[PDB]
Chains A and B, each alone.
With several copies, the nearest count.
Chain A
Amino acid sequence: XXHXXXX
């Protein structure tokens, strides 16, 4: 569905 990207 959506997008997730982090660190």
Chain B
Amino acid sequence: LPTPHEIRNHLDDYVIGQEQAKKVLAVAVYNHYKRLRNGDTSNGVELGKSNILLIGPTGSGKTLLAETLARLLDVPFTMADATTLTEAGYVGEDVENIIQKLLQKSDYDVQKAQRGIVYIDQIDKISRKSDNPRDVSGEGVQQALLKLIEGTVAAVPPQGGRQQEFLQVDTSKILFICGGAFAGLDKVISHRVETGSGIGFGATVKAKSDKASEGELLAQVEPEDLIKFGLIPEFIGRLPVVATLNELSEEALIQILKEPKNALTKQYQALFNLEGVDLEFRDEALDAIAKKAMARKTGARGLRSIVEAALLDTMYDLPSMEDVEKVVIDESVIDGQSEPLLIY
């Protein structure tokens, strides 16, 4: 049933700018389900576990891929958070609660829940930082999660009980997608491999050029680098598949403002349409916006700042203004040097 060719096209409809990452997920997703079709029946013994490790910058679409995949996929999907997770459940939460929410989506169907997908956001949150210690969000969380990720049956009261019984739902079959923004990881990889600082005439020095630090550096990531970050090596050993996402290109940004149905121009113009005046954006403004956005280095999430701040003056006085049929925005408006000219 799974198709790697079609799934890549489907993700392209909702995600843009990450072509390599789509290929990685299609292989792991196809392999994981194929394994369950014939479980441990092949001649090959000790088959490697198929897991996913999403790693990319902010606004790269980590949370977006989990949403799009859930809609396209038939099995139930869940969206949890690592910040809420706590060890030995004092007042925050428990690891077993993740399984309870999965059944609510699957309507207490063990046969249908074991084939489900799991996605945990902000994986970096559980990084073990116990230099000055007890720790409720550090080693305790990762230790409990590793036990679950290893594959074990955990007691879960079905429906809560009206019984003193619990179901032994398997865990090795269920898939897991550990993803989150890694801050400081680039420095760790750069610290290990620099291959520079040559003072000789023959030697070369690169101060601004960083050999595509946003994308190339991620491609050369190793498990040993994450160990210094704080993660446990056994946790990384269980995830042979890692996804690397490069920084969005200026071309990709333009596509994100036009092709998607959640585009800023579409919603903002729709909002202006309610007022009664149409909104027009030229192509020259779009490429200009992309350059400013990349400078901020905030991702797509910070794109809105440039568009809104530029239109702050226009929206403030637009209701008072009358007899304006359409609004025209030029490239200079993005810079802010020239005010936009209205159409009557």
Interface residue ranges, A against B (CB under 8 Å):
1-7
Contact = CB atoms under 8 A, between A and B. Distances in A.
Contact of A1 (B90, B132, B135): B90
A2 B134 contact: no
Contacts of A4: 90-91, 136
B88 A3 contact: no
Nearest to A1: B91
B112 to A, nearest CB: 31
A2 B90 contact: yes
Given A1-B90, A2-B89, A4-B136, 15 more contacts: A1-B89, A1-B91, A2-B88, A2-B90, A2-B91, A3-B133, A3-B134, A3-B135, A4-B90, A4-B91, A5-B132, A5-B133, A6-B132, A6-B136, A7-B132
Contacts, number: 19
Interface residues of B, number: 9
B137 to A, nearest CB: 10
Nearest to A2: B90
A4 B132 CA distance: 8
> Looking at chain A's contact residues, is the secondary structure mostly helix, strand, loop, or mixed?
loop
A7 B11 CA distance: 45
A5 to B, nearest CB: 3
19 contacts: A1-B89, A1-B90, A1-B91, A2-B88, A2-B89, A2-B90, A2-B91, A2-B136, A3-B133, A3-B134, A3-B135, A4-B90, A4-B91, A4-B136, A5-B132, A5-B133, A6-B132, A6-B136, A7-B132
Contacts of A2: 88-91, 136
A7 B133 CA distance: 12
Contacts of B134: 3
Interface in B82-108: 88-91
Question: 5 tightest CB-CB pairs across the interface, nearest first?
Answer: A5-B132, A1-B91, A2-B90, A2-B91, A5-B133
A2 to B, nearest CB: 4
Interface string B131-170: 0111110000000000000000000000000000000000
A5 B90 CA distance: 12
A7 to B, nearest CB: 8
Contacts of A6: 132, 136
Contacts of B89: 1-2
Contacts of B90: 1-2, 4
